[PDB]
Symmetry: C6
Subunit: 49 residues, 6 copies
């Protein structure tokens, strides 16, 4: 069920279940870090003021 | 139905899932995601 | 049936869903998504 | 079998579905999509 | 259950059940060909 | 259940079954190589 997309500066995101997860790949250290995690519902809430 | 996504300019991106397309922005400096726009894909 | 999408220039993007190709634009300035064209058979 | 798609230069893009590769072009100015090439699954 | 992604110079990859295939689209010649084929079996 | 995404300098990622693998395609040597592998839970640390 997951889908992924690219972002700037070698970041990328995954959307799986209700959760969006943002990652970074550091080519220099050759490693990835999970940078941020949101439940889509809290995002929806934020958006409906 | 399985979601699909796609990138957009200025660190925005799109997620299309079940009759809806949602556009988000990732702000790298604040390290935040915001939902910016919802769209009913039924035109 | 099972959608897949892809990016295009100037904040346009497209999606393929059961023999149908739909092209859209996101206009960041107006914060609005619009359907721009649709096809099935080329 | 499900589809998967991907971008290319100059507003072209491709779809892979049921063992087939189709490449399309989107002309923003005419607001049109032309299929450009299409391969059965083989080199 | 295919997935694809773009690469530089109009190349693109498709991953199908443990097999990566890299292609190139040559817009000018309107041609696609298989550049490499690889299986997840990694060292 | 697999999804992929592009990165800088001809690298690309494959997300698949809780596992993120990261590759590089050397157009010059015309070859690809796995470079890093992770479990999503590892990253969740």
């Amino acid at each position: 069920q997951p889908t992924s997309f690219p972002l700037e500066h070698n970041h990328f995101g995954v959307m799986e279940d209700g959760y969006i997860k943002i990652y970074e790949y550091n080519e220099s250290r050759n490693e990835v870090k999970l940078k941020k995690e949101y439940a889509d519902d809290e995002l929806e809430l934020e958006h409906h003021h």
